[PDB]
Amino acid sequence: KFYIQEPPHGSPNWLKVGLTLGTSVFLWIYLIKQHNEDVLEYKRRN
Amino acid sequence: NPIIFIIILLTIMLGTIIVMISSHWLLVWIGFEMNMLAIIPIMMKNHNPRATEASTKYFLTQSTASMLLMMAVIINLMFSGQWTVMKLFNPMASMLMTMALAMKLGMAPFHFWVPEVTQGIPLSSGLILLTWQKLAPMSVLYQIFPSINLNLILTLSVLSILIGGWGGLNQTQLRKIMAYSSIAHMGWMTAVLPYNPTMTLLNLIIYIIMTSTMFTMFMANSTTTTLSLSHTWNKTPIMTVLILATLLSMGGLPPLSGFMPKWMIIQEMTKNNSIILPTFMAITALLNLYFYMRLTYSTTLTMFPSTNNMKMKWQFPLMKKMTFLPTMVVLSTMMLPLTPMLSV
Amino acid sequence: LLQVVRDHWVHVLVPMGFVFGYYLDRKNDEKLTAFRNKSLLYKRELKPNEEVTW
Amino acid sequence: XXXXXXXXXXXXXXXXXXXXXXXXXXXXXXXXXXXXXXXXXXXXXXXXXXXXXXXXXXXXXXXXXXXXXXXXXXXXXXXXXXXXXXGNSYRLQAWLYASRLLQYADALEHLLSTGQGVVLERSIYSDFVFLEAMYRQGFIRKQCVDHYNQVKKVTICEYLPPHVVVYVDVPVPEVQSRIQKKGNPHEMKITSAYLQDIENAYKGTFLPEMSEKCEVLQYSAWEAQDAEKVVEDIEYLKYDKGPWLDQNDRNLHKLRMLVQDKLEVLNYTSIPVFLPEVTVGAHQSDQVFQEFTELPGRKYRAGYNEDVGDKWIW
Amino acid sequence: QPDVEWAEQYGGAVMYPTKETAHWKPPPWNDVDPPKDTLVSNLTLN
Amino acid sequence: XXXXXXXXXXXXXXXXXXXXXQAERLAIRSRLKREYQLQYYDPSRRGVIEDPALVRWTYARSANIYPNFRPNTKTSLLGALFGIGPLVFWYYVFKTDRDRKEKLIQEGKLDRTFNISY
Amino acid sequence: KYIIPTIMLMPLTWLSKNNMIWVNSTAHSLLISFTSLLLMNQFGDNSLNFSLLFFSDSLSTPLLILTMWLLPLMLMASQHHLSKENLTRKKLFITMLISLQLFLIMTFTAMELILFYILFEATLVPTLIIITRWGNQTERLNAGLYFLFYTLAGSLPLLVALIYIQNTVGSLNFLMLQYWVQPVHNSWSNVFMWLACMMAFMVKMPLYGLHLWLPKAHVEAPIAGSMVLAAVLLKLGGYGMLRITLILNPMTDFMAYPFIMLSLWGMIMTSSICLRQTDLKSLIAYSSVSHMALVIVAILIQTPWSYMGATALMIAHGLTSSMLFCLANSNYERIHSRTMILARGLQTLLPLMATWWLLASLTNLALPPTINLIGELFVVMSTFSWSNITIILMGVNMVITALYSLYMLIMTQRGKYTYHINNISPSFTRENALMSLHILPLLLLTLNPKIILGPLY
Amino acid sequence: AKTVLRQYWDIPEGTECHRKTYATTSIGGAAGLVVSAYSVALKTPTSFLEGVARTGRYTFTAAAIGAIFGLTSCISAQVREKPDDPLNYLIGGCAGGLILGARTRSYGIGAAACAYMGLTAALVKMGQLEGWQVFAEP
Amino acid sequence: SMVYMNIMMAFTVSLVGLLMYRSHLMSSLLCLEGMMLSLFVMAALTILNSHFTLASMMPIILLVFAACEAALGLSLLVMVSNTYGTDYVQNLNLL
Amino acid sequence: XXXXXXXXXXXXXXXXXXXXXXXXXXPRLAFVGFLGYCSGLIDNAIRRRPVLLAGLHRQLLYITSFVFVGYYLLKRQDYMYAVRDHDMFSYIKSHXXXXXXXXXXXXXXXXXXX
Amino acid sequence: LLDLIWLEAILPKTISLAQMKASTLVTNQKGLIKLYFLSFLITILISMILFNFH
Amino acid sequence: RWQEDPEPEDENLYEKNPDSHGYDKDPAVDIWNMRVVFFFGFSIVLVLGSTFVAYLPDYRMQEWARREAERLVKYREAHGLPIMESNCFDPSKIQLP
């Protein structure tokens, strides 16, 4: 069949697919850095 | 409607911010009017004979309503003097103020425009805006909840679920059922305002998300019960499971997120020694469920709406948050027990 | 090795789910450490074992 | 989100020799179909005539659905020997109207994005001629006509332009002799009263089309089959007073969104009203949905599909 | 199973058969069209 | 219910109206039997036959509840006295027995010494 | 230990291939039910709490084992149905049973009233979707709406009841903490406090008034007969009447007096109708009213002897009525109608299933001590200590207990079957296995019924 | 007015009922006028001739409910002892719902919901004790 | 006090005028102007007699927004006369 | 407390009081994380895509967004419950007269019959 | 009499009367902005005269 | 007119194209499910589960109380006069009224 009359999505976009996988990396590093900072602040206070 | 349509939509977003961040009584009047001049064009859009009737009915019932608010603003100059949105002070001013707020939120004697205005919108995008506009005058009520006489605020809550619980029974129009679902839920809104200011804003968080998910499920065009009926067999069958889940949560049922506001409304009211009023809230809540129960029979039962015409091509709607928000709308019972404190 | 892994994949999850439930619900007693040696009803002094029994 | 601030915009690189042409309502015999193929000298793209399997001609993947998979009891040969009570009759024509409306939306989408002249064989403004000819004889009930008029008022008004170029051919009353000479044996032995009524209804269809200030050119059987005569007549005639000349910013953008999606265009095409010749039975609908999902064509649908394509998981 | 006769009971009219108001007709499928005519349309001068 | 003489063969006459009356009964009896005969004597069936008379018998008790009872009259109130009434009848029976028992516990003991169960 | 492996049944049915499904859902459920008997039975003098208050221990609940017993059995009789339709539809209505099993475990385990309430009404949602779909006959909605608007109309008054207690008297929570509770002073303001806690359980446990919730759910069959076993679980799912009456209102029994008299007439009149009825499923539906009416009588007496009979009858009825509905389903799959008179013929066509028909029918009566003799007789013995008059009314009911069973037997024990041509194969290997898996657990309770009745036993 | 409603609670403390019956008509009369005002929105045919006709049927019947309720409460108080009871007002509540069947020739409706109207009327005098509160602040 | 007693009575007449309808639709928008006119007198006098200086700008802002509703709602009136013959409250289709 | 008296109005999280220590790998966070995975299962039901579980790998965005917002949302939960308790204990300490203590009794209670 | 009609007549009693109360709001007031604004005149008078608050 | 409503057909496995089976379709799935794992629960829950029930792990002080009672009887008989019950958990209460 090979999807006739041109499909709306080819499947690899890279412009949209690449950044969406990139945003998860930006979120994961940001959360652990504040997590270590919160424990360091709690130990300094108490 | 090209680029400037987003700008018109932005002024409603910015309009509520003026109401949110305010200290002056004339500043919120500006904030309400920012919505007045910006919803009407989206109410029209395509220009229809039904749209012309709805937009005029939306204007006249709401512009006169805000004009009653300006009287209460001017009584705050005659009495108590100061221009601050902290307290209402005068009982004479509160009578005209609460009735002006009832024209937008209380609904019990001012529901009349809602079933005609909500039906009159030609587009699904306009349905979201009326459920989002109700956030604006709630910010006013959260500021001036003391001093206002509770005898004529709780009557706007008790009677609203009565007329909301009967006003959807003789309606087949899908927009009309959701119009009376507003008034039914608005009774729960005007009940927590006298009894503990918190969870009143969380009632909005549950409601607005639940209603925004509802109309975005109707992005596949449906305006009547019979038009939403032909969806299980002819159209997408897995889509109707999410319509079922959202409708079950619209009524008071425990394993869903929609029961979680109904928890604290009764809980805070029972703490104030009142038992006879929350009992009446629970029995009238059953009448609300019945509309959603009949509308779940378009998703559960066969009902025979096969039709000759069939769709094979994949549907591509707008769907801004029609995937993330229904997951919170279906299950948030275990997820949000201590979250009452997080909102306010 | 190829015949067993391809055919069975969901069959392992249920007995392993019982073990996962066994470990999780047992470790909740570590949150409730109060009244272990105190209150004379089943109280006994330790001789060799630490904190009587978990 | 729709992008309009970008380089791609309406009216740009269009309109200059890109208007749609239609050769419609020319009796039962396909005489307009042959002349439309030669009419694509000035026009860039030419579209095929719609039948029973016209919506599934492209749709998802290449091959058309077999008999029951496309539409329950739908055949062009079955309408030639039409039977009253329990059968095709109206539900084939309702499927025929929905198929012509779907291909019109894609042709308009082909016109709006990248300005190319698309010629359509038998448009949506010709199906009412085909229905009324059969209504004169005892075949279609009065209640089914009211079902047709309700769809007619909703679907048509959403699209702004009808047609810039209209070709109407009026042949001899002895057109049945030409149909008998044709290669198809199933199409033969058709009723003479239905063909005569089709020409009579077409006479009251060209006049309201001309009333909306759309350019129309009449051609006889002797004037038929001409490439030089048809192309020169369309080029010399200028479009005036027609509803095609609309707003470039507001009107053109709104019509483009409705034509872009296939599901959005056919959303109003399905009626909530129940009819005996429309197949309302849910029991047959459950079995048909199971067979369509099991089919190697669409199955999972929208781009990615197992045992058909499958390029990437993400 | 529910048939076409059961669907006509919950059809678009009044949900509840009308007591007094039964003259109100059902609305159109995708926004009703009202009066095409009843307009002046083009002025005439002597 | 029975009369002075049991009805089995009492009061029978040939006449003309009674002769046609038996002809009317056999006309329906043979009509409903032949449609059963056409359904029973073929191997192609395999299954349980419907019969419209038996379905309407079950429909008489399971349904036709609220289509009826629209003439309430005095017959419905007599049925209410036979239903809600006997519930009030035992209210003056169980209470009188309990008041007899409760007085005995406080003064002049009647309960057995070898009683411990409940 | 109990929850988590039950939740893992949800990804099990979806991940497995289309040819299997039913093999994985039944086999894996049986080994979880074995482990429930392995750990829950251990208790001291007063049954000590399991862990933190999410799911707690059992004090007087061997009824959890019954839910684990039906956990695979709610899949066996539903095999005849659902097979004709789509593979995705099969997976959906197995997971709705898994969700039912998820919420039903939570109700009996968790020693609470506040969080118990949001699990009490939570069982209604999956059953609603179960009843409103797959119903062969019509009026699914005239039973589906009645399923909620009877229960939710009575149970929503618990929000104004339970919260009112915790705002004044400490907190409800553990129940093991609930000894703060002072006896009620008995006043006109305290009337609606007692009624709101009762009316919720007056619906699920059927009486004489507001009893029509149950026959509509049974006659209008959800799916085949395996979902009707879940409708039996809903009757015993309102077990909190054992907990509320003992703890929340100990002094209050004067207001219980009219409610006993209502349930006492819900024994003669409910049995009389269960004689001349046409539907085979209805003659189990009305006998289930009277059998569960015996429990309501026992609770409101509050004697230590009555709770022994109350806890026994919850398990007794939970495996005898469900057994009877499987026999009703076995005739419904062959004759395709629930009519008793039309579906007539045992032993001649159904040789081995007729012995299962006998064992199921006689268990409704007082047989040699299986469970129902430890159930029914214990209540009758306890009613005499309440009042001497009771056994005059209760003895008449013991005559009509035969008239449920024997009338179901005799109207099927005629070897005519002239109109019927179907039912060639008597029973499949799974169909006979269903009948054994209901009676043989009760036959094992003959040796030791300690794990059948245990409120301080 | 709430001052009219506050007068209703002071009289039953004694034995006098001659002025109590006069006060009950104003409670039922004013409440009937509220329903009578909303019935104008149903579009009345002609002017005044049928306008008074719609207001006449609603106000006169609603005032009759209150008037009999005030009378029956005092008959039940004078016969036998006991000053105030929920059982005492339940008999008076049944008489108030009995006259709704006199409005239309059907014998039921009012008599069918006689136990429903009688219980709700009893609930008003259930809240004479400190246990029930309709509106509260703390 | 004394001057405020008459303009409050003038406010109630303009309030009823909004709530009253007989055939014509134009009266409502005329009453919306009158309502804002009566509010303009009430606002001005309170700031003028009891001096504020900063708050005297507030009725000037109120004057601007009064016209905004009396133009954008007034524009909808003309749209009724495009669909229908003439503007009537009696002429409505919605239920 | 609903109205702020000591706490700063309009805060990103708290900032005035930071010392509390947020939960690490909590059972509450796992349920919000499960809903993030659940939102990435029903999104393929809307836009018809092969397999809900083994489909598109844009599910990681849905899980992370629920965790990141949920962590901040639960941080406010631990903060607001602490302030609610802090003002409660301070009210007893400052006033003293409002609170009363009673321990050890020998009071008679009415016994029930049957 | 009882087990199908009279004992049932508790909830159908609150359906037949509920639908009558439902019809008095939906079918009532046949459109018209005129009629809805005539009802708002009374609502202010209820809050001032009928209900004692300022 | 029904159009598409007529589709109902009687279906039964019985014995035809199944030989002897309980599961619908495929002989390989039937034997491995309906006779093996169907009866594996019959062997573990019923037969191996019969050892538990109440027999073995004492079960709420049913066997413990007998040994505890007998030693308390013989001790109180030799020294005291009152047998077991006389004043249950009451020794010097602080008045009554």
Side-chain angles (χ1 to χ4, degrees), chain G residues 33-41 44 50-240:
Chain G
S33 64
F34 178 75
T35 51
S36 66
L37 198 81
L38 199 84
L39 289 149
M40 194 58 83
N41 283 296
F50 202 87
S51 291
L52 285 156
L53 206 63
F54 201 84
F55 76 104
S56 191
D57 74 309
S58 166
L59 268 75
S60 61
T61 319
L63 195 54
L64 186 82
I65 315 296
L66 188 137
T67 319
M68 300 296 277
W69 261 108
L70 287 159
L71 146 79
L73 276 165
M74 285 182 283
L75 295 156
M76 316 305 197
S78 61
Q79 198 71 59
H80 196 96
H81 217 273
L82 304 154
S83 189
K84 290 174 183 178
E85 278 77 51
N86 288 48
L87 293 150
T88 47
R89 292 184 201 177
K90 292 178 190 181
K91 294 177 191 75
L92 279 156
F93 278 79
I94 290 160
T95 49
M96 292 320 290
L97 288 154
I98 294 154
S99 69
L100 256 164
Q101 284 144 11
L102 207 150
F103 283 106
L104 276 156
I105 287 160
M106 285 289 195
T107 49
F108 296 111
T109 48
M111 288 293 298
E112 219 168 331
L113 290 163
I114 335 147
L115 203 138
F116 169 73
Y117 169 74
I118 52 99
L119 300 157
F120 177 79
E121 293 180 324
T123 51
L124 293 158
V125 186
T127 37
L128 176 79
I129 308 152
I130 276 158
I131 291 154
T132 51
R133 212 193 281 260
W134 316 98
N136 297 297
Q137 266 70 46
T138 48
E139 64 271 306
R140 297 189 208 168
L141 320 177
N142 290 304
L145 291 159
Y146 277 79
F147 182 75
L148 292 182
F149 282 87
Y150 259 104
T151 321
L152 280 157
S155 59
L156 279 162
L158 275 173
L159 279 159
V160 291
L162 297 157
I163 305 298
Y164 188 77
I165 308 150
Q166 70 160 63
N167 286 335
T168 52
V169 190
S171 56
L172 301 167
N173 52 35
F174 263 91
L175 266 88
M176 297 292 281
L177 194 81
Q178 268 195 283
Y179 297 108
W180 293 70
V181 187
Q182 288 175 305
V184 192
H185 298 273
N186 193 64
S187 295
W188 290 106
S189 59
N190 294 301
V191 175
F192 286 90
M193 195 185 78
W194 186 87
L195 286 164
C197 282
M198 286 283 100
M199 210 75 79
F201 294 87
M202 292 291 101
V203 180
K204 280 200 182 286
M205 302 263 277
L207 308 150
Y208 178 70
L210 303 154
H211 80 287
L212 212 127
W213 168 76
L214 199 76
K216 287 277 176 74
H218 293 314
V219 173
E220 278 77 56
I223 319 159
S226 261
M227 311 298 109
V228 199
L229 327 173
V232 174
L233 281 155
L234 291 154
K235 287 187 277 289
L236 49 93
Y239 91 112

Side-chain angles (χ1 to χ4, degrees), chain L residues 32-33 51 64 69 76 80:
Chain L
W32 201 73
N33 176 49
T51 52
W64 180 87
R76 211 175 282 103

Side-chain angles (χ1 to χ4, degrees), chain B residues 229-254:
Chain B
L229 207 81
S230 185
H231 216 98
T232 43
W233 321 112
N234 209 344
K235 278 189 177 181
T236 42
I238 328 150
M239 273 269 282
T240 49
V241 188
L242 283 154
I243 302 158
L244 172 80
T246 45
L247 277 159
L248 283 156
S249 64
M250 280 287 278
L253 289 156

Side-chain angles (χ1 to χ4, degrees), chain F residues 90 92-98 101, chain G residues 257 264 383-384 386-395:
Chain F
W90 294 106
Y92 295 94
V93 180
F94 282 89
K95 199 179 177 285
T96 47
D97 192 65
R98 256 277 155 101
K101 280 189 175 182
Chain G
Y257 172 78
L264 277 159
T383 46
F384 186 74
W386 176 268
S387 57
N388 306 319
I389 332 148
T390 41
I391 323 159
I392 310 153
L393 285 154
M394 288 281 273

Side-chain angles (χ1 to χ4, degrees), chain C residues 11 13-15 17-18 21-22 25-26 28 31-32, chain G residues 1 3-5 8 12 15 24 28 32 35 51-52 55:
Chain C
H11 202 281
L13 292 161
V14 187
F18 180 77
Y22 192 84
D25 288 317
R26 185 69 76 94
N28 277 44
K31 204 179 275 178
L32 295 156
Chain G
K1 287 185 182 183
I3 52 143
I4 291 148
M8 287 298 281
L12 174 76
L15 200 80
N24 295 296
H28 285 287
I32 311 300
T35 51
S51 291
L52 285 156
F55 76 104

Side-chain angles (χ1 to χ4, degrees), chain D residues 27-123 125-173 183 185 193 201 204 208 221 224 227 242-243:
Chain D
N88 298 55
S89 187
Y90 179 76
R91 62 175 166 180
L92 178 74
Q93 203 74 244
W95 183 258
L96 206 140
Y97 182 77
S99 61
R100 290 208 203 274
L101 194 83
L102 203 141
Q103 65 163 45
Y104 182 81
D106 284 62
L108 201 82
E109 205 273 301
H110 198 270
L111 203 145
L112 286 152
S113 61
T114 63
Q116 283 184 302
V118 185
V119 179
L120 286 151
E121 290 170 56
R122 295 262 284 273
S123 60
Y125 296 89
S126 187
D127 288 299
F128 69 97
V129 189
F130 207 84
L131 187 92
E132 281 182 297
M134 198 65 76
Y135 177 70
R136 298 281 174 184
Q137 287 84 58
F139 288 96
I140 310 156
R141 211 171 76 257
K142 201 186 177 287
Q143 285 186 303
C144 298
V145 192
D146 288 66
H147 185 88
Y148 188 85
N149 282 113
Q150 281 182 51
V151 185
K152 195 196 271 178
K153 287 172 185 178
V154 175
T155 53
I156 282 157
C157 292
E158 286 183 302
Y159 298 96
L160 288 153
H163 271 284
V164 186
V165 186
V166 186
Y167 272 94
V168 183
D169 294 297
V170 183
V172 286

